């Protein structure tokens, strides 16, 4: 359990130094299962696009901007107001919203028969209750969520039978086709900004500095290295009598400065979109190092007095919109938005450490007694690994299991002469380097010489499992002692000659790590002569 | 063992609704150990003072202020520079810094003797090596950190014995007494601001808005509900040709506004500290609802041209300092800073939920087989709890343990007439309410009528363990079957007459929760007649 405070204090007062040294034994090492690097840290991991969104919220807030949420869904005529006649072309880029009608369907008599053939007992009453539920669904008074519930309730059947009725008796529901409206999703924040400002200016003291960082949707040819069907705009508007394009320049500098950028460039936007005053629509470029090229991070301009007029705004307004995903690409060094935004549809490679922590000890003794017995036994072997043969090393110990004592005589030996007790590889340690697994000896005596610079490099740069051959071997041995005791076996022999695989030293690897090791076509080279012979007797 | 995708898809494709209902069995319920509320959420918990510090950094950053770190340690003469002659009084509140000298000690034969008597073999060489280590320590070239190491290294002894030599041969080290200096800890940010500003003004374009939120130290008579020896100042300075107290007023308003405050008060500071221009030192008050009274959150003013002059600053400077702990007291509703700041030295009461999650099931079967057997058995009893006596309920089941079959006949009965199989309390459920534990029946027939409004209230407002008597009872029974098999026992009877304690239904409570249950003088009332007789035979 825990340790004796009194005994520790007394031992320490007799002689502090001995006590400090000796008292280390009161601190147990962890179960082999849970030693580093098999012990992994757990922490929450943010998404780059969303951390960039928060950092942008704060870059705007720290410039005095007031945070807003604008309408997402806007009528097409809003886009005609802002873009003018150009909207008959620009509206190609916007998603229209469409939706299913309600079905007008009735009950009886063929349907009544279907429902009866389902095993349902229907009154006239039940038939009317359901006739009403269907009416209400036609008239829009019941949600789709709720229709299985209401049917079930109507006929007094199970929920699932409600669904059964729905799909069996009324399959014409499947013939509903979505019909489009005049409503669209905003393709940039502006489509909302006008609506928000039109209502807001008259109520507020100018100048206004507003911002919103929120989703926008474009209907594009395809998705790109730098384009998605849905993106995030880090948009703002500055409203005031004296506003000009320079305000956009200053907002772009202030946003980018806070992210570390010292160099960006402005460049006229050939499009000259009509919601912007002529010759004010400006592109902002920042440098993407991994791509080598300059990338468009933002766009700004001053709204056209014509659009502003159509929204009852009589004062100039500067707009700036920065694409969150672009900035994020630069920040985190991604070269493909699709792979940055949705990394789940791509691959998750395991590092040397990841793999080193997926290498586990197979059989280990379950009982504390024998686990410690194992550790001690390991240290014993490591102490006599060089005994000159013929050798033997006995360990007799008594274990008490309630009433009965059993005495375990584990003996590990070497009959044949001119040998040593254990062999050149018993202390080999399993490393992982560059996707490879190597069981490496502490010194390269007798190692083939092409191999040595590789193993030296893995031993230097790679990640260790901190498991030696001897460790897994002995845990296997003592686990076999436990196994023996519950199996009514009094004697057995156990031997590890030349080690050829992970299995041979009682280790295994998580299948996910194997799949990669193979897939990347790398090696698991665990090998060595480890001639360990043991006999155990259980009296 | 996961579930069969192919079998599922096929079952679902035959008849979706049946399949949807039936496949619930493929979602295994959790081990009783890990069912809510014994399963607790785990998350990191911020400290109110530090969370308030961060929110304050952001309140300052969002006003355009530039964040700084100022010197913490300042010479007393700095305080005379700022406070003028008043510093001969004000310096009372400041901590002086002191430190103990290096000892001048030599070796020589009396000590050499001690070191030998310690068991250490000392050469002339070792003696000279240690003579140097002691020299270097006098001359300040060895850190205290490092001295036990160096001593050991000198004498070629263990680390711990380096320490032993240190404390045994040179105990005069203990006679070192601390000598004071002229250095003090800052008692407010101002003591740093001047220094910082003196260096910074010449290098920068005015106006400057700087802020720092960092520790300050005062020597108070004693610590208060609202005073600690060390506190955090959320200080700032506004530097510019046109600053006046009004800048302090807007900084105080802007800080407090962002925290939700719509209401604060200004009040002249009777002190008229001399580092502030006359009649500008202002106190800021905010309302502490729980205390009922108005509390001082901040202080501001304009530095005195005399103090500014002594720092080579020729332009007015407004300073404001808000005490973080005060603001935190208001925000989180604490009435005692010492208890808000250092809550570990106070008490941690366990909520009803806390205690309900510290009620554990004692014995539960280890083998999946018997665990499920147990659940099945529970449902069987709950199904036959009302069988009219004489009753009996057999459950014969055969279990396979590698080679051998064993057949377990669990029989649950009631020989005596005019009763039922189980009894009125068998489905009672354990609740926690207002620090109390109650085992409560689903209905209040036969309950003394004094009790009923209480138990009704606990059942409505309290927190349930979601364990019924029958649950713990049966887990105990089957656990005993397991014990039996391992113990070579083929028959036993098992009976639960009237329930009197938690133990009677195989439950126990965490020691920490009991300590409170007792300390707070509350009850653990679980009792009921649950007459369950069972016989178990193992063939």
């Amino acid at each position: 359990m825990r340790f004796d405070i009194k005994k520790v204090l007394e031992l320490a007062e007799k002689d502090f130094e001995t006590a400090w040294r000796e008292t280390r034994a009161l601190i147990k090492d962890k179960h082999i299962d849970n030693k580093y690097p098999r012990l992994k840290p757990v922490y929450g991991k943010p998404h780059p696009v969303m951390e960039t969104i928060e950092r942008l919220r704060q870059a705007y807030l720290r410039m005095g901007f007031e945070e807003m949420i604008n309408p997402v869904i806007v009528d097409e005529m809003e886009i005609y107001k802002q873009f003018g006649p150009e909207a008959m072309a620009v509206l190609d880029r916007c998603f229209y919203l469409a939706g299913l009608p309600r079905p007008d369907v009735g009950l009886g008599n063929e349907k009544v028969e279907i429902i009866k053939n389902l095993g349902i007992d229907i009154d006239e009453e039940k038939k009317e209750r359901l006739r009403e539920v269907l009416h209400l669904y036609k008239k829009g008074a019941i949600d789709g969520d709720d229709l299985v519930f209401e049917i079930a309730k109507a006929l007094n059947v199970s929920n699932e039978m409600g669904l059964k009725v729905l799909e069996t008796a009324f399959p014409e529901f499947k013939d509903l086709k979505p019909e489009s409206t005049t409503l669209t999703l905003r393709s940039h924040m502006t489509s909302g900004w006008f609506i928000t400002l039109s209502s807001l200016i008259k109520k507020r003291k100018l100048p206004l500095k507003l911002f919103s960082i929120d989703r926008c949707f474009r209907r594009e040819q395809r998705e790109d290295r730098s384009h998605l069907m849905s993106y995030h705009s880090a948009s703002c508007v500055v409203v005031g009598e004296d506003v000009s394009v320079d305000d956009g320049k200053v907002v772009a500098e202030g946003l980018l400065a806070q992210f570390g950028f010292t160099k960006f460039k402005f460049k006229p936007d050939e499009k000259k979109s009509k919601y912007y005053t002529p010759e004010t629509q400006t592109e902002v470029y920042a440098y993407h190092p991994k791509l080598g090229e300059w990338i468009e991070v933002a766009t700004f301009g001053v709204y056209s007095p014509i659009a502003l007029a159509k929204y009852n705004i009589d004062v100039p307004v500067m707009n700036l919109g920065l694409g969150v995903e672009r900035l994020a690409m630069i920040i985190y060094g991604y070269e493909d938005v699709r792979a940055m935004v949705y990394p789940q549809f791509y691959e998750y490679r395991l590092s040397d450490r990841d793999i080193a922590g997926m290498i586990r000890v197979d059989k280990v003794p379950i009982l504390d007694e024998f686990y410690n017995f194992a550790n001690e036994l390991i240290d014993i072997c490591i102490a006599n690994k060089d005994k000159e043969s013929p050798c033997s090393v006995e360990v007799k110990r008594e274990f008490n299991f309630n009433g009965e004592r059993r005495v375990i005589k584990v003996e590990i030996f070497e009959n044949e002469p001119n040998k040593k007790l254990l062999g050149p590889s018993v202390l080999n340690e399993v490393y992982v380097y560059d996707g490879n697994i190597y069981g490496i000896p502490p010194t390269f005596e007798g190692v083939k010489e092409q191999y040595i610079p590789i193993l030296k490099k893995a031993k230097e740069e790679g990640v260790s499992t901190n498991i030696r051959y001897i460790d897994g071997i002995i845990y296997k041995l003592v686990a076999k002692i436990e196994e023996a005791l519950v199996s009514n076996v009094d004697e057995f022999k156990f031997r590890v000659p030349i080690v050829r695989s992970l299995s041979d030293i009682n280790l295994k690897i998580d299948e996910l790590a194997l799949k990669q090791i193979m897939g990347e076509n790398k090696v698991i080279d665990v090998r060595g002569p480890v001639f360990l012979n043991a006999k155990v007797e259980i009296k | 063992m996961r579930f069969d995708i192919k079998k599922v898809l096929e079952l679902a494709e035959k008849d979706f609704e049946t399949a949807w209902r039936e496949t619930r069995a493929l979602i295994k319920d959790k081990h009783i150990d890990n069912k809510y509320p014994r399963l607790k959420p785990v998350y990191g918990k911020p400290h109110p003072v530090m969370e308030t510090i961060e929110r304050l950094r952001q309140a300052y950053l969002r006003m355009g202020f530039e964040e700084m770190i100022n010197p913490v340690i300042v010479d007393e003469m700095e305080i005379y520079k700022q406070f003028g002659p008043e510093a001969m009084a004000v310096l009372d509140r400041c901590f002086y810094l002191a430190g103990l000298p290096r000892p001048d000690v030599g070796l020589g034969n009396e000590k050499v003797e001690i070191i030998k008597n310690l068991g250490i073999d000392i050469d002339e060489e070792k003696k000279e090596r240690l003579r140097e280590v002691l020299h270097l320590y006098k001359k300040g070239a060895i850190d205290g950190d490092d001295l036990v190491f160096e001593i050991a290294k000198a004498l070629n002894v263990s680390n711990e014995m380096g320490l032993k030599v240190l404390e045994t041969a040179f105990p005069e080290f203990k006679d070192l007494k601390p000598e004071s200096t002229t250095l003090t800890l800052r008692s407010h940010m101002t003591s740093g601001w001047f220094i910082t500003l003196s260096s910074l003004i010449k290098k920068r374009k005015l106006p400057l808005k700087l802020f720092s939120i960092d520790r300050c130290f005062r020597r108070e008579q004693r610590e208060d509900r609202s005073h600690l020896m060390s506190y955090h100042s959320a200080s700032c300075v506004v530097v510019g040709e046109d600053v006046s107290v009004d800048d302090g007023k807007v900084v105080a308003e802007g800080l407090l506004a962002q925290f939700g405050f719509t209401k604060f008060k200004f009040k002249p500071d009777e002190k008229k500290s001399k580092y502030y221009t006359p009649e500008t030192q202002t106190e800021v008050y905010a309302y502490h609802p729980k205390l009922g009274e108005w509390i001082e959150v901040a202080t501001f003013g304009v530095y005195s041209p005399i103090a500014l002059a002594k720092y080579n600053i020729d332009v007015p400077v407004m300073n404001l300092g808000l005490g973080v702990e005060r603001l935190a007291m208001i925000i989180y509703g604490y009435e005692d800073v010492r208890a808000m700041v250092y809550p570990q030295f106070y008490e941690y009461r366990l909520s009803d939920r806390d205690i309900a999650g510290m009620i554990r099931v004692d014995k539960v079967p280890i083998l999946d087989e018997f665990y499920n057997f147990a659940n099945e058995l529970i449902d069987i009893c709950i199904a036959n709890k009302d069988k009219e006596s004489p009753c009996s309920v057999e459950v014969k089941r055969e279990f396979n343990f590698n080679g051998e079959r064993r057949v377990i006949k669990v029989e649950i009965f009631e020989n005596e007439p005019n009763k039922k199989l189980l009894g009125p309390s068998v489905l009672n459920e354990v609740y926690v309410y207002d620090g109390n534990i109650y085992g409560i029946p689903p209905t209040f027939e036969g309950v003394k009528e004094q009790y009923i409004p209480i138990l009704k209230k606990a059942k409505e407002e309290g927190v349930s363990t979601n364990i019924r008597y029958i649950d713990g009872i049966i887990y105990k029974l089957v656990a005993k079957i397991e014990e039996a098999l391992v113990s070579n026992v083929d028959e036993f009877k098992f009976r639960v007459p009237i329930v009197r304690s938690l133990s009677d239904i195989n439950l126990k409570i965490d020691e920490l929760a009991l300590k409170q249950i007792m300390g707070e003088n509350k009850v653990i009332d679980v009792r009921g007649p649950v007459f369950l007789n069972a016989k178990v035979e193992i063939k």
Partner: peptide, 26 residues
Amino acid sequence: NHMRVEYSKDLIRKGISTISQLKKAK
């Protein structure tokens, strides 16, 4: 560890096997 739990359950079951066959041996 999920593997350990099952190993220990394995030890338990073979202990019961051995007990059963040691019974019907006698």
